[PDB]
Ligand binder design. Structure first.
Ligand SMILES: *[C@@H](C)[C@H]1/C(=C/c2[nH]c(/C=C3N=C(/C=C4\NC(=O)C(CC)=C4C)C(C)=C\3CCC(=O)O)c(CCC(=O)O)c2C)NC(=O)[C@@H]1C
Ligand SMILES: *[C@H](C)[C@H]1/C(=C/c2[nH]c(/C=C3N=C(/C=C4\NC(=O)C(CC)=C4C)C(C)=C\3CCC(=O)O)c(CCC(=O)O)c2C)NC(=O)[C@@H]1C
Ligand SMILES: *[C@H](C)[C@H]1/C(=C/c2[nH]c(/C=C3N=C(/C=C4\NC(=O)C(CC)=C4C)C(C)=C\3CCC(=O)O)c(CCC(=O)O)c2C)NC(=O)[C@@H]1C
Ligand SMILES: *[C@H](C)[C@H]1/C(=C/c2[nH]c(/C=C3N=C(/C=C4\NC(=O)C(CC)=C4C)C(C)=C\3CCC(=O)O)c(CCC(=O)O)c2C)NC(=O)[C@@H]1C
Ligand SMILES: *[C@H](C)[C@H]1/C(=C/c2[nH]c(/C=C3N=C(/C=C4\NC(=O)C(CC)=C4C)C(C)=C\3CCC(=O)O)c(CCC(=O)O)c2C)NC(=O)[C@@H]1C
Ligand SMILES: *[C@H](C)[C@H]1/C(=C/c2[nH]c(/C=C3N=C(/C=C4\NC(=O)C(CC)=C4C)C(C)=C\3CCC(=O)O)c(CCC(=O)O)c2C)NC(=O)[C@@H]1C
Ligand SMILES: *[C@H](C)[C@H]1/C(=C/c2[nH]c(/C=C3N=C(/C=C4\NC(=O)C(CC)=C4C)C(C)=C\3CCC(=O)O)c(CCC(=O)O)c2C)NC(=O)[C@@H]1C
Ligand SMILES: *[C@H](C)[C@H]1/C(=C/c2[nH]c(/C=C3N=C(/C=C4\NC(=O)C(CC)=C4C)C(C)=C\3CCC(=O)O)c(CCC(=O)O)c2C)NC(=O)[C@@H]1C
Ligand SMILES: *[C@H](C)[C@H]1/C(=C/c2[nH]c(/C=C3N=C(/C=C4\NC(=O)C(CC)=C4C)C(C)=C\3CCC(=O)O)c(CCC(=O)O)c2C)NC(=O)[C@@H]1C
Ligand SMILES: CC1=C(/C=C/C(C)=C/C=C/C(C)=C/C=C/C=C(C)/C=C/C=C(C)/C=C/C2=C(C)C(=O)CCC2(C)C)C(C)(C)CCC1=O
Lengths: 67, 57, 169, 169, 160, 20, 161, 161, 161, 160, 161, 160
């Protein structure tokens, strides 16, 4: 499967949390290709700042043999 | 010829009959194999030098 | 616990039945002399293969009571008598009971438990059964001893016996 | 079964309240409408057979498939059963008109009605349309006659229409 | 069987069986006489297979039949042979069904839990299955031997 | 074993009798 | 679920017994019919939408069910009925391949009657729909496969009834 | 949920009918009432907290319910109860605006009795509190609007019976 | 869940009372028992696997339960059963530490009987296994902590029969 | 391919692959001769297959070639025949693979949205692949016809 | 990931051509290798745990790596290392059985070297242990199958190295 | 240590160390010398502990030092005693630190996995640690014995 490696910064609106929240804020994680559109929308519409997107696993221009 | 006296003398309670999975069913086979127990091995932890005998591969 | 071999008309069930024929005195003396015979002609003990922690407290009690009380406790175990320690003993698995008797013998040999009466000699039938057991293989021996000591202690429902071995005063 | 007065009394007893001004006003409204309700019931009694027949004829003109093969009014057996069901609805609507309360329809018409029609394959929608046709015929009849109050007339039929019909929005 | 595993996969994706799954089921179907021949051969000589395998095991692992070993004693050895018999029967089910699901669901799921609770050295259980595989393979032809050895290997791997 | 004492019943306050 | 092979294996395993001759002949019976089941399943998988369409068109269309006031009125409910039919056809094919109706009893029927009585879905009309599916499929896959698919569609109907 | 307009729409739709004279008459009647409904809703929304406060003071405070052992004892239970009164007032306002009790059937009274019985909440006390809310709301919004809001609060109360 | 201290506090709070002499006596008694409870719980945590092993060997092994056709037959079901015994022992130890059986009702016995009846799990065999756990624990931990552990294991048994 | 999907399904459960999967790999490898025979037959005969299928489709669906249809005229007829050739390509790609995955990766994952954005009736394309099927199923041997019919029918079902 | 079949399919589809002469030839070569491929896969699956066990015994154990200071010291480091070798064998077996190494990129070497650099796992001892694994494997299957396994395990090692 | 454990327990709820935690740390610091001597008693007599316990174990579990066992032969007997010395060292770390964590994080995380790969039975490693516990307890006072027994029993529990 294609896997992106997305880096994002998520700010905190509507709440001043007192527990540890740094892990949720600026995170780098592997995302399956199929979920990246939905995840991009979710991070954006939450107020996030997607710094970086790369194709960690997979190739461009691949018509077959992606799963 | 079938003799009912032989069967009467040979009566066994039903609940005492062996059913599938009972390990008793392998008592005869276990006896026939007669597994050989190892000899009493003479080991003294006192006389072992750990540093020298432990492999240094 | 583990399934016992009671009546099959083979050397192991036959010897087990013979051990069950012996009196309480014969049986208890036989297991003492078998213990003395362990490691040369009978199979050794391997107490690490039994959850002996279950017996720990009981053994401690035996090592605390007086010599007469110690001998009486062993006699109670052999007499199928109803005492708290007999019930505790009966609740264990065969391996734990056998390791418990082994530790009792070790303590007696070490003196912490009341030893056998001085100059005691095994009887005729008991010695014959012990010789038979010596004639068997190690696996057969462990099976025979396990089934020998499994019925000791107290279990409800079962009952009987008339001979008894009270003390050696 | 609960009529308007019983419904009011239940509401007030739930809270352990004596009847207050609002209760007396509602009872007064029912009692003053009583004559018109009785007149409407009598007019329905004077025309029930013709009301049912004409409503069924109009329904089968509006949905001709009902009396054609595979229609649920197809064959005289099913046709008679359908006219019977229309008669049921008119009789219980008259009851509800007199009581000024639709609980009689809930208890004795609607509860389990969907289940029965589903079990038999009776189509609910045409039955609801027939109920509405009968309602319109009753309203026109009441308008023609010398009746003063005719707004209550729609209440039972509409109730059945709302209770039995599928939810679209 | 294979049909059930393929059905579960096809239903998990809300789709009918694919051409590949259909052809796989078809191959397991038409070439189903060899599976039953292998199963019949294993079932016919279960006594000898288990006895020879147990003898081989106790030769390789006499510790389990020595003081402190789980199989020490007549009764313990009998139960060990019974366990080997269980696993041979399960292997036959797996061979017949063209799948390893019945073996998995009868004698492998949580098998480590059971044998850890019993004190039994599980690696020796895998070794006993190895001996049973060797004997059974000696008792069959080359292709039948390979087909049975695949499922024996599945069982051995799951306890190794 | 989990039902609280105040749930679904009248909880009477216990007071020592006045004659004590 | 259990298929015919698993049915035999479970019957043998609950007794601790190896497979005997009768079990072997039952497995032989299942292997004998497996080709038929694969071909019938292939035809039905190819034509599923068309069986459903023709069965709806022959049983439910231009009736009270689709007209205003019927349970198939409005597009949401129409799509719901077609969806249920897709499930019934697909699970009937699954069971037919398995040779056992167990998957129907567990995925389809265990809760469906309560579901349909809760929602108010008419069971007479849906039984008519499944029967129409039965005849359409019987027309497509032939005599033997038609009867076999019949068995499981009738099974769904009886579970509903 | 289903308001007066939506109820008319449903009645017309299930007969495949366009809106006739009677349906338009019902819509016009609801339109006539709309001004009063909006006015009452505005006033209640502005004064929901104080309506609840006065109802609580009237029916609940300084009784066994708020004393140790009572169901309103402890701050969490008191907050929950005044939250419930907020629920009932808000949903009664919704029903009054819609001119229909269906919202109450769908998301107020469904399983409510089981909820309170499982929690141990006393039914009679909450009925009296809702009556107090009806009285306070009437004293705030006048006789006519109080009659309508009382219809919906009494609907809730009858649901709890 | 409530421990002994929390039970005392809840009875007092439901009365609205400060803790009087009797409540303090109950608290003192529980504090006195705390060391014994902790020692026993440490022993059980040490020997949990052995306790379960010996209870199973005493009550369940070499019977129809483990043989083909019994509920413990198959490695999966064996593992599930010994897992359940571990659960019961862990929760009995919790209860003994707390001096209250409430955790058993809120976390273990809630719906457990219905669970075992829907699964076909034999209840008498489970009760016998739990009683074997009780005897093993008594022989391992003593006769006082043995008695308390027996109280809570018998509580688990009471909620299963 | 069948090998790829076997490997990914195994890696899902983190296993080395089970006996049935390797058996199917063996069977498909050995039958590669017949599968490539069918593929070559379809490749060499592609133009005739497409032409006959298009003629019988248009006799079956004379609306799409009528004014207003997606394939109206000769240039749009050329595009529609080109799509028929593309999906014949995908059928030949699938048959040599032993699995349907290439067909979905290229031609079926997104086809509905594509044709809707084009206005093409996808059920008419299903009919086109059907006509391709009943033409190809007489051009080769009886078993080869069915072996290709599996992939034809999969395409039809996924376009229905 | 891609197999040889999917590799040629991808090339042909990128260039938009049917299966051409060279494509047929390369497919034929894979078909001619797909018997030793499956045999080697079965043999490797049969005794993989022993393969890794013997490799570790002859290549890693009783040296400074397993001694205090080495990166295998600790019951946790040892577990991590042995599962790493086991994963290497599984994925190399997949790679061998498919005639390609794209799976190694997409499911093993996805940032593995960077992870080992970050976490300090040596990049030389890993390749040495993999040398041992491929040695045992080749001695366990055959010269050509062992050659394939060594090629793919060296592909992994280079991705690490 | 106890301070690190308390720090993590305080940060789990995003707060400062409670006065109870601080007072427990105070008591631990003040009683420091007693455990700083218990560790020395265990360390100075380490060879006695390991060898006496190993002899007692091989009397407990003769099978492991018997042919086919995991420890048979002088070489494997020595390396098993090596493991015993390692675990005694971890127990000394535990008594010093006041916490079972460094023992867990060094010698009990993945211990089952490693010993599975090596073939050692784990009940016997638990028995080895238990014999070490008994021999060590015999060398010290009752209260010191219980203080060390807490950690010895923790190690036993994480093994069997
Ligand atoms: C044609 C078949 C008949 C028909 C069907 C119909 N069904 C529904 C609604 C639902 N059907 C289901 C079905 C299932 N649940 C399951 O778990 C399974 C799988 C085994 C099935 C088959 C469900 C869950 C629903 C409810 C969905 C929802 O939440 O909306 C409808 C719509 C009913 C409604 O009120 O919307 C219809 C129309 N109806 C007929 O009249 C046909 C004879
Ligand atoms: C105060 C001296 C200066 C300042 C602060 C400031 N911080 C943020 C936002 C965040 N700060 C953190 C930091 C942490 N969160 C943690 O959990 C920890 C580790 C334990 C740390 C150190 C984080 C993660 C954020 C973002 C997420 C969140 O705030 O929940 C802001 C930005 C506010 C905003 O919403 O944009 C500010 C203002 N700013 C100054 O100018 C001061 C010098
Ligand atoms: C009159 C000279 C002729 C005639 C005409 C006629 N019929 C109807 C109405 C109905 N006819 C039926 C018939 C049947 N029901 C059955 O089950 C069968 C099989 C035994 C038959 C033939 C029914 C059910 C109706 C009522 C519903 C409908 O309108 O179809 C009418 C109209 C009556 C009205 O009052 O509007 C007329 C004019 N029937 C004859 O038999 C004569 C030859
Ligand atoms: C006429 C407008 C529609 C119609 C009717 C129809 N109904 C039946 C059968 C039954 N109808 C009922 C209904 C009721 N029973 C009650 O007690 C009441 C409450 C007061 C009602 C409304 C019942 C229970 C039955 C079955 C039992 C019986 O016959 O008494 C049929 C016959 C169904 C059949 O074929 O078996 C018909 C035809 N059919 C239409 O097409 C109209 C929509
Ligand atoms: C023989 C190769 C090894 C061995 C075996 C052994 N097992 C036991 C006891 C049991 N074994 C099982 C196993 C199963 N039950 C099932 O349902 C399944 C699948 C169908 C399996 C594999 C069970 C449940 C038991 C408990 C006894 C009972 O059957 O009720 C023992 C005896 C243990 C004891 O202490 O009694 C033995 C000896 N032991 C070895 O050392 C060999 C490596
Ligand atoms: C006209 C613009 C297009 C067209 C229409 C067409 N429709 C049908 C058949 C049906 N249409 C419906 C639609 C609805 N039912 C509802 O309840 C609602 C929601 C309010 C709608 C919109 C239904 C359900 C059917 C099925 C038949 C029935 O009523 O029972 C057809 C006939 C199809 C056939 O073969 O039966 C046609 C022709 N066709 C076009 O080409 C136009 C684009
Ligand atoms: C005193 C420092 C402040 C103050 C107090 C005050 N409170 C009320 C009324 C109530 N107080 C409570 C509180 C509780 N009930 C509980 O169960 C708990 C915990 C167990 C608490 C804290 C409640 C429930 C009431 C309602 C009355 C009743 O008991 O039934 C009042 C009276 C207000 C009124 O209008 O009646 C007062 C005066 N007021 C201040 O100004 C101080 C800051
Ligand atoms: C064994 C020969 C050598 C060794 C290994 C070792 N590795 C780690 C930690 C990790 N190893 C991996 C492995 C992979 N990442 C992937 O993407 C793939 C594909 C599935 C694999 C196999 C990963 C992800 C980690 C980091 C996270 C994790 O804990 O798993 C360790 C742990 C080191 C530590 O705990 O600090 C070790 C010991 N070490 C040696 O000394 C050998 C040369
Ligand atoms: C002795 C009580 C039992 C026993 C042990 C045994 N272990 C091995 C080999 C190893 N043991 C370890 C363990 C550790 N290394 C660590 O760093 C840690 C943390 C402190 C632990 C626990 C390791 C890594 C090995 C591998 C060899 C090496 O240390 O370099 C053996 C030898 C196995 C072999 O095949 O050589 C043995 C015998 N065996 C028993 O039977 C006893 C119950
Ligand atoms: C290998 C292995 C093991 C096996 C271990 C084994 C084989 C253990 C076997 C141990 C044996 C044989 C123990 C016997 C002990 C006998 C005693 C203490 C009797 C004393 C008698 C007295 C005091 C009688 C005195 C007397 C009195 C007072 C009288 O009244 C008058 C005379 C008389 C003499 C009768 C384990 C089971 C541990 C684990 C598994 C495993 O594999």
């Amino acid at each position: 499967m294609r896997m992106f490696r997305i880096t994002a910064c998520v700010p905190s609106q509507t709440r001043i949390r007192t527990q540890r929240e740094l892990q949720n804020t600026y995170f780098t994680k592997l995302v399956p290709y199929d979920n990246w559109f939905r995840e991009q929308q979710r991070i954006m519409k939450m107020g996030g700042k997607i710094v970086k997107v790369e194709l960690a696993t997979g190739r461009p221009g691949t018509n077959a043999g992606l799963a | 010829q079938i003799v009912w006296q032989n069967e009467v003398r040979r009566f066994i309670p039903q609940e005492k009959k062996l059913t599938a999975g009972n390990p008793m069913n392998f008592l005869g086979m276990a006896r026939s194999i007669n597994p050989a127990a190892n000899t009493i091995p003479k080991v003294s932890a006192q006389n072992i030098n750990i540093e020298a005998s432990v492999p240094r591969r | 616990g583990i399934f016992p071999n009671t009546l099959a008309a083979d050397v192991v069930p036959a010897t087990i039945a013979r051990f069950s024929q012996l009196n309480a005195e014969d049986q208890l003396a036989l297991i003492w002399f078998a213990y003395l015979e362990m490691g040369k002609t009978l199979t050794i003990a391997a107490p690490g293969a039994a959850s002996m922690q279950l017996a720990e407290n009981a053994l401690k009690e035996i090592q605390a009571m007086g010599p007469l009380q110690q001998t009486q406790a062993m006699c109670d175990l052999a007499n199928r008598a109803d005492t708290p320690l007999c019930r505790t003993y009966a609740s264990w698995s065969p391996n734990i009971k056998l390791g418990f008797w082994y530790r009792l013998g070790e303590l007696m040999e070490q003196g912490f438990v009341a030893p056998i009466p001085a100059g005691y000699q095994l009887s005729a039938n008991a010695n014959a059964v012990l010789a038979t057991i010596q004639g068997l293989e190690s696996g057969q021996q462990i099976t025979v001893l396990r089934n020998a000591v499994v019925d000791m202690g107290f279990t409800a429902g079962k009952d009987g016996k008339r001979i008894a071995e009270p003390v050696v005063p | 079964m609960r009529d308007a007065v019983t419904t009011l009394i239940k509401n007030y007893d739930l809270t352990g309240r004596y009847l207050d001004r609002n209760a007396m006003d509602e009872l007064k409204a029912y009692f003053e409408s009583g004559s018109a309700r009785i007149a409407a019931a009598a007019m329905i009694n004077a025309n029930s057979a013709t009301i049912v027949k004409r409503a069924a004829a109009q329904l089968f003109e509006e949905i001709p498939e009902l009396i054609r093969p595979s229609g649920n009014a197809y064959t005289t057996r099913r046709f008679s059963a359908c006219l019977r069901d229309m008669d049921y609805y008119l009789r219980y609507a008259s009851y509800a008109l007199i009581a000024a309360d639709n609980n009689v329809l809930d208890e004795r018409v609607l509860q389990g009605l969907r289940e029965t029609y589903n079990s038999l394959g009776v189509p609910i929608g045409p039955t609801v349309r027939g109920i509405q046709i009968m309602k319109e015929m009753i309203e026109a009849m009441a308008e023609d006659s010398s009746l003063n109050s005719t707004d209550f007339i729609a209440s039972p039929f509409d109730h059945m229409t709302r209770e039995l019909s599928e939810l679209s929005v | 069987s294979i049909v059930t595993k393929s059905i579960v996969n096809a239903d998990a994706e809300a789709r009918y069986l694919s051409p590949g799954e259909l052809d796989r089921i078809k191959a397991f179907v038409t070439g189903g006489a060899a599976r039953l021949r292998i199963a019949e051969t294993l079932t016919g000589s279960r006594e000898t297979i288990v006895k020879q395998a147990g003898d081989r095991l106790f030769q390789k692992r006499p510790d389990i039949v020595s003081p402190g070993g789980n199989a020490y004693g007549e009764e313990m050895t009998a139960t060990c042979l019974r366990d080997m018999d269980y696993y041979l029967r399960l292997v036959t089910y797996g061979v017949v069904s063209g799948d390893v699901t019945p073996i998995e669901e009868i004698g492998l799921v949580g098998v480590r839990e059971m044998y850890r609770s019993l004190g039994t050295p599980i690696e020796a259980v895998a070794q006993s299955v190895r001996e049973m595989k060797e004997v059974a393979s000696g008792l069959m032809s080359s292709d039948d031997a390979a087909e049975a050895s695949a499922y024996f290997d599945f069982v051995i791997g799951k306890m190794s | 074993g989990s039902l609280r004492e105040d749930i679904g019943q009248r909880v009477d306050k216990e007071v020592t009798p006045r004659f004590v | 679920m259990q298929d015919a092979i698993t049915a035999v294996i479970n019957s043998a395993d609950v007794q601790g017994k190896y497979l005997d001759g009768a079990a072997m002949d039952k497995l032989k019976s299942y292997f004998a019919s497996g080709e038929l089941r694969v071909r019938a399943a292939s035809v039905i998988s190819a034509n599923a939408a068309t069986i459903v369409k023709e069965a709806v068109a022959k049983s439910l269309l231009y009736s009270d069910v689709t007209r205003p006031g019927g349970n198939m009125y409005t597009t949401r409910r129409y799509a719901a009925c077609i969806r249920d039919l897709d499930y019934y056809l697909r699970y009937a094919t699954y069971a037919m391949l398995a040779g056992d109706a167990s998957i129907l009893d567990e995925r389809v029927l265990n809760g469906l009657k309560e579901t349909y009585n809760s929602l108010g879905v008419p069971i007479s009309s849906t039984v008519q729909a499944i029967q129409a599916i039965k005849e359409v499929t019987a027309s497509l896959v032939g005599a033997d496969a038609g009867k076999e698919m019949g068995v499981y569609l009738d099974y769904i109907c009886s579970g509903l009834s």
